Structures are given as structure tokens and as C-alpha cells.
Design a protein around this ligand. Structure first.
Ligand code: BEW
Ligand code: ZN
Length: 256
């Protein structure tokens, strides 16, 4: 029964998921004066031209926009990565107020939200096998700040009313995730974990330096979602973010 409240939030997760206190937990604070440029990093390649979205689901924690990952249609390669990583879903974490919401922080700065584009390493055949491997996933993290509207997010915003409560889904075909990307692909990378239970330590994190801007009306529609199921008392889906975790013996590298 994990969640984001007092009684079931991040400080409780370690009881059911002891890896919460592990050596490679995410998110982390990115100290820009400690992260070092790595000339060994190869160019990052985001190839989303043939992406095939299918559906959007409120899972009681966030919403997932799901993709057809039965073939190499939307892949992430290059940068720190060896091989090919297939896009399976994206989701966001966000706050109740514009001053909080992101999971990663940059010199302790919190953004209003954070987008996670989740990809799995095709050498392991499926997502479920990939998450049991230290290089099984690659998550592209993108910060959201409140300013101008993001045209490419509006199709997402406008379907949320149809998936207000936990367990609801809606058809969501022909959504282009390229429209959620900032101009620059300058990034930081480090080894980490899923930021939700089961908190598996399988992720190569790639966190873009340049945030995207979204409008206050857009993020306000995120905040109208519900953690609860239909017919239950309303608990707004806000502050579904885990705070920064100890860096331990890890290196954050910069691509720039
Ligand atoms: O929050 N989250 C859920 C699933 C896979 C990755 C991540 S970051
Ligand atoms: Zn996430």
C-alpha cells in the first residue's frame, strides 16, 4: 500500500522494499560543481520517429503513457549506453506548488515537475527481465518549469479528465513524444534506481540539463488528477515525487 502520504510515503517504503536504503538509489541531487565532463561519452541518440503510443493509464501513483515496444520503433542509444534501449512508457512526477515536484534536483533546486521516458535494454528480451539487471533500463529525465505552454504536452493535458481516478485508462494513439523534448540534449548521467517501489537498482539515468517550459494551466490540470479510485473520497494526485537520496560511491558525469 505504498504511496506519497504521511502514513505510506517515501520514508515508509524501506519496510516493504529494503533496497530503499541501498547503494544506488534515485533520485539524487546533481551538484553541478562536482559533476565532471566525460569526453568518453558518445553522442546521445533519441530516435522517436516511429513511436507508437497506445494508451494512457492512471495507476493510482501517476499516469503512464504506454508505447508498443514489440519492435525497435522508439529507441534511445549512445551517450553512456551500450546497445539499444526501447521506449516502453513515460510518466511524470509533480508538485502541489510550482516550487516543488521534481525528483532530481540541480544544486538543490527543485523544478515544478519531472518527465521520465522509460526504456529497456533489448539484450534482455523484455522489461521484466531487464529490471533484474544492473544495466537493464535507461530513463531519460526532463525537468519542467512553469512559464510558457508546451504545445506538445497539450494532447496529454486534454485527456486527463478521462482518467481522473485510479485504474482508468483511455486510448492514446498517435502521440509524438518528440514534442516533449527541449532543444538541447546536454545531460548528466549516473547509475541509479526506479524512484518508485520496487526501487530496483537497474537504471542508467540520463537527466537533461535544459528544462522544458509548461504553462500554469497545464500543470494545474495534472493536479486535478486523483490518487483514489472512482467513488472514493478525493485525494488529489500531487507531490508524487521521492526526495533526493544519498549519492554514496557514485559519480555523476556531464556530457557538456
Ligand atoms: O517512477 N517509475 C516508474 C516505473 C519505471 C521507472 C520509474 S522512474
Ligand atoms: Zn519516474
Amino acid at each position: 500500500h505504498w504511496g506519497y502520504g504521511k502514513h505510506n510515503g517515501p520514508e515508509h517504503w524501506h519496510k516493504d522494499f529494503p533496497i530503499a536504503k541501498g547503494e544506488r538509489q534515485s533520485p539524487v541531487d546533481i551538484d553541478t560543481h562536482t559533476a565532471k565532463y566525460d569526453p568518453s561519452l558518445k553522442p546521445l541518440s533519441v530516435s522517436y520517429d516511429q513511436a507508437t503510443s497506445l494508451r494512457i493509464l492512471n495507476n493510482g501513483h501517476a499516469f503512464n503513457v504506454e508505447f508498443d515496444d514489440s519492435q525497435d520503433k522508439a529507441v534511445l542509444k549512445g551517450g553512456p549506453l551500450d546497445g539499444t534501449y526501447r521506449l516502453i512508457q513515460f510518466h511524470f512526477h509533480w508538485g502541489s506548488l510550482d516550487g516543488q515536484g521534481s525528483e532530481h534536483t540541480v544544486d538543490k533546486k527543485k523544478y515544478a515537475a519531472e518527465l521520465h521516458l522509460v526504456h529497456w535494454n533489448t539484450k534482455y528480451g523484455d522489461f521484466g527481465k531487464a529490471v533484474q539487471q544492473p544495466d537493464g533500463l535507461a530513463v531519460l529525465g526532463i525537468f519542467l518549469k512553469v512559464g510558457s505552454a508546451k504545445p506538445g504536452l497539450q494532447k496529454v493535458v486534454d485527456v486527463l479528465d478521462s482518467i481522473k481516478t485510479k485504474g482508468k485508462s483511455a486510448d492514446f494513439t498517435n502521440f509524438d513524444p518528440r514534442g516533449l523534448l527541449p532543444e538541447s540534449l546536454d545531460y548528466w548521467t549516473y547509475p541509479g534506481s526506479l524512484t518508485t517501489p520496487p526501487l530496483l537498482e537497474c537504471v542508467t539515468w540520463i537527466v537533461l540539463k535544459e528544462p522544458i517550459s509548461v504553462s500554469s494551466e497545464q500543470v494545474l490540470k495534472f493536479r486535478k488528477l486523483n490518487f483514489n479510485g472512482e467513488g472514493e473520497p478525493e485525494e488529489l494526485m500531487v507531490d508524487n515525487w521521492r526526495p533526493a537520496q544519498p549519492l554514496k560511491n557514485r559519480q555523476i558525469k556531464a556530457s557538456f
